[PDB]
Design an enzyme around this catalytic site. Structure first.
Site, short mmCIF file in Angstrom:
data_model
loop_
_atom_site.label_atom_id
_atom_site.label_comp_id
_atom_site.label_asym_id
_atom_site.label_seq_id
_atom_site.Cartn_x
_atom_site.Cartn_y
_atom_site.Cartn_z
N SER A 119 0.90 -1.18 0.00
CA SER A 119 0.00 0.00 0.00
C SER A 119 0.93 1.21 0.00
O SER A 119 1.53 1.47 1.04
CB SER A 119 -0.96 0.02 1.17
OG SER A 119 -1.45 1.33 1.40
N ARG A 120 1.09 1.90 -1.13
CA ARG A 120 2.05 3.03 -1.20
C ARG A 120 1.60 4.18 -0.29
O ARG A 120 2.45 4.98 0.05
CB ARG A 120 2.21 3.58 -2.61
CG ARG A 120 2.84 2.65 -3.63
CD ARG A 120 2.58 3.27 -4.99
NE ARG A 120 3.09 2.51 -6.13
CZ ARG A 120 4.24 2.78 -6.74
NH1 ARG A 120 4.98 3.80 -6.34
NH2 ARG A 120 4.62 2.05 -7.77
N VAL A 121 0.33 4.27 0.07
CA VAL A 121 -0.11 5.32 1.04
C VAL A 121 0.40 4.95 2.43
O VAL A 121 0.89 5.85 3.11
CB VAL A 121 -1.63 5.54 1.00
CG1 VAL A 121 -2.10 6.52 2.06
CG2 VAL A 121 -2.10 5.96 -0.38
#
Lengths: 172, 116, 269, 59, 115, 115
Positions: A119-121
């Site tokens: 999850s890049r967030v």
């Protein structure tokens, strides 16, 4: 929140129309704009600022941010993530949750492969309590991944390596 | 190129050179051209050369470029990575393992290389 | 010849590489268990050597037949990095030497791979034992050791030796041959007769040396197994790397062929 | 025993003429069953060289 | 390659060579990971003969003399059958593996082993 | 195949069989290179049950008598559940592997072991 249960079936329907319209084919017979098909759809899922909502509603709504979260689903063939449509959508999205047949047959029901899923967030999308308790959980699952073979021969392990393994098996 | 012509040394950052190759494949398919090996456009090496040959050091100034590279299916022999590696002068590799030790920047001194 | 068959071979070899990597650490763990067992048995042997020295020096009135002028140790299992072969290679040099002298040879065998070697060359084994645990007990060695001691008392053997590997370091096992049978101001209050004590102590001493040779050979075996499983893990990595290059070639060729058939079919329609 | 030291050199099992002789007879019996007859002995050198060459290629 | 065309002696020698080379090809992956020492006493003897057969098939040519320097060799069918039949029977189990490489007839392998 | 549609006893038996066969799929390749003796005491036992489960899945059909030679067997849902739970719990660990091959319900496997 929006769920697209099969973007791969939307691509197959668009490929059919394109071939019947006699448009030039590319890899796997998909048209030259199959990347643009999914990208034009998925870039609408977003979070908009308070100024955008205030401008759109002509001042009727103030100090609030709106959003659209997307959970697209794609079906792979024998785990091949390098296929044309899967490759396009993996590159468009913010993260991926990978489900595996080997884990699902080994009784691990929600078959989430935590090792490759991303999850890049990240922690920006987590409450304070979950963010604090999640860091230790990730370390355990990584350790168990690096020590799984030594499970059928735990007798001959250092106490501390034996320890890491038992925490890994319980967290899993 | 305008900043270079003012007598400067310039940095050109390209977010992803693989997406430049794919956009060329998409346009080539839309124009109906006959596809090449592994489905890439027949103009693959020329489209890369037209972009990469402008990035050089001249008598007035220079343009140095840092380009992020994506490798399809982890295959370094694929036409996109293979065509790109012919133009690169240095390779900087970032390591998740080095970042875990608290060292920053996370460059791998053993995998990273330079022709210089 | 086919991407999917290649992908199945890669997964098969990868599954095998994961266990040979684990088996190396298991061999190191068992090596440490064997090394502590080697040290635990030393005090008894050195003390028995210290008594026999006086009860013979201080008592020059009696000489045991063992004080005036082969037992082979081997493993019961696979994955030995040349351990048994280097020992048999070293033994044949001395057996050949005894035939240049024209002497007859008697043999005793410990372990299944040693029994298999002499059985494949017709070796005249007089006593044998096999299938011992990785942590052996001295009561099992009494049998094989007595047959070899009796052959000395009966005048059938002039010299007796124990053939086994010695632990130089964790990365070096040395094949060796050690002689077994042919070896200050006060005196002890001998309750039984001194002959009975010396006759019994010399037997306990030889059995203890054979037990120490067996336990040190087991430490050498776990060290040899560590190297063999490390090599197996590295050899599997080279095969995986070569298959991945062949797989990528098949992946690129399949895409090129499918595109050629689609362009060919659409040029006709 | 010595005035400044007492050493007990114990035995793990109870030695005895029957137990002491039984183990020798079982070890002899094992060797009878193991060996059937003589065989070629000159082959030792060739077999050792074959395995010494083969064992090097593996590492 | 038929018993009715070349006779049973040639046919069985050729079939024997192919059986040994086929069995050696099946062991290649096991030998590559674990080495030759883990094989059975029967497989070890077959692999040793397979390696000798594979080397005895080599032959220096009269047109290849320029590449290496070695003189060329012409081997009759009689000498060919006799050499491979002897290696299959085990008549040469004692000679070293390098004695069969580049030697024409089987008698020259016996002379090469003297060095 | 949902506990809310059938029941927990059926579902647990099905997932139990699948778990044993899935674990055996990774061990099959291990045994073929390093042998059975290098597995753990739990793995050796599990492999034996997996090979028995794999055979107890077999059944001679009435429409297949022309291919099999033996007569056809109809088995019921409860009989099927009881037979697989018995092999999973260890009630048949003493029976030989060949006794479960082509035998309808669990009773006939106990009888085939005596022939």
């Amino acid at each position: 929140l929006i769920v697209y249960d099969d973007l791969s079936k939307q691509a197959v329907a668009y490929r059919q129309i394109s071939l019947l319209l006699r448009r030039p084919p590319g890899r796997e017979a998909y048209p030259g704009d199959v990347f643009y098909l999914h990208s034009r759809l998925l870039e609408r899922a977003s979070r908009v600022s308070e100024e955008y909502v205030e401008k759109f509603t002509n001042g009727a709504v103030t100090g609030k941010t709106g959003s659209l979260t997307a959970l697209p689903i794609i079906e792979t063939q024998a785990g091949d993530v390098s296929a044309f449509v899967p490759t396009n959508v993996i590159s468009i999205t913010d993260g991926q949750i990978f489900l595996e047949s080997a884990m699902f047959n080994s009784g691990i029901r929600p078959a989430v492969n935590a090792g490759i899923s991303v999850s890049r967030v990240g922690g920006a999308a987590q409450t304070k309590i979950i963010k604090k308790l999640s860091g230790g959980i990730r370390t355990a699952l990584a350790q168990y991944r690096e020590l799984a073979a030594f499970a059928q021969f735990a007798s001959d392990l250092d106490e501390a390596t034996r320890k890491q393994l038992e925490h890994g098996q319980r967290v899993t | 190129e305008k900043f270079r012509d003012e007598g400067r040394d310039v940095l050109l950052f390209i977010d992803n050179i693989y997406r430049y190759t794919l956009a060329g494949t998409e346009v080539s398919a839309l124009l109906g051209r006959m596809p090449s090996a592994v489905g890439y456009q027949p103009t693959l090496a020329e489209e890369m050369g037209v972009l990469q040959e402008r990035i050089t050091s001249t008598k007035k100034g220079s343009i140095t470029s840092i380009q992020a590279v994506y490798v399809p299916a982890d295959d370094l022999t694929d036409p996109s990575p293979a065509t790109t590696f012919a133009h690169l002068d240095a390779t900087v590799v970032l390591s998740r393992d080095i970042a875990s030790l608290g060292i920053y920047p996370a460059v791998d001194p053993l995998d990273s290389t330079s022709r210089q | 010849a086919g991407a999917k068959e290649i992908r199945s071979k890669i997964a098969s070899i990868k599954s095998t590489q994961k266990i040979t990597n684990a088996m190396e650490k298991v061999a190191v763990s068992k090596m440490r268990k064997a090394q502590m067992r080697m040290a635990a048995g030393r005090p008894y042997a050195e003390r028995i050597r210290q008594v026999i020295g006086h009860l013979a020096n201080a008592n020059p009135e009696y000489r045991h037949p063992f004080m005036v002028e082969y037992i082979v140790v081997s493993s019961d299992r696979g994955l030995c990095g040349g351990l048994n072969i280097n020992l048999f290679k070293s033994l044949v040099k001395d057996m050949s030497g005894y035939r240049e002298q024209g002497a007859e040879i008697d043999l005793c065998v410990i372990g299944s791979k040693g029994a298999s070697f002499f059985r494949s060359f017709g070796g005249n084994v007089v006593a044998a034992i096999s299938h011992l645990g990785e942590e052996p007990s001295i009561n099992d060695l009494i049998g094989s050791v007595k047959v070899m001691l009796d052959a000395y008392l009966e005048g059938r053997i002039d010299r007796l030796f124990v053939v086994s590997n010695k632990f130089v370091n964790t990365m070096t096992q040395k094949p060796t041959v050690e002689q077994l049978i042919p070896l200050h101001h006060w005196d002890y209050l001998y309750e039984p007769d001194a002959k009975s004590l010396l006759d019994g102590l010399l037997v306990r001493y030889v059995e203890s040396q054979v037990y120490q040779a067996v336990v040190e050979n087991n430490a050498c075996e776990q060290a040899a197994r560590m190297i063999a499983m490390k090599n197996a893990t590295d050899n599997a990595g080279e095969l995986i790397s070569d298959l991945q290059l062949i797989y990528n070639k098949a992946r690129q060729a399949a895409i090129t062929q499918e595109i050629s058939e689609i362009v060919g079919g659409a040029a006709a329609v | 025993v010595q005035p400044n030291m007492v050493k007990v050199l114990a035995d793990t099992v109870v030695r005895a003429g029957d137990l002491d002789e039984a183990a020798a007879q079982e070890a002899l019996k094992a060797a009878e069953k193991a060996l059937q007859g003589k065989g070629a002995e000159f082959d030792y050198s060739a077999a050792a060289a074959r395995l010494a060459e083969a064992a090097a290629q593996l590492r | 390659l038929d018993p009715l065309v070349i006779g049973q002696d040639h046919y069985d020698t050729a079939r024997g060579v192919q059986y040994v080379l086929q069995r050696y090809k099946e062991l290649k992956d096991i030998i590559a990971i674990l080495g030759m020492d883990e094989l059975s006493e029967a497989d070890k003897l077959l692999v040793a003969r397979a390696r000798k057969i594979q080397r005895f098939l080599s032959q220096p040519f009269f047109v290849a003399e320029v590449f290496t320097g070695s003189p060329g060799k012409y081997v009759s069918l009689k000498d060919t059958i006799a050499g491979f039949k002897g290696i299959l029977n085990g008549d040469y189990d004692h000679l070293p593996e390098q004695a069969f490489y580049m030697v024409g007839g089987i008698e020259e392998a016996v002379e090469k082993a003297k060095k």
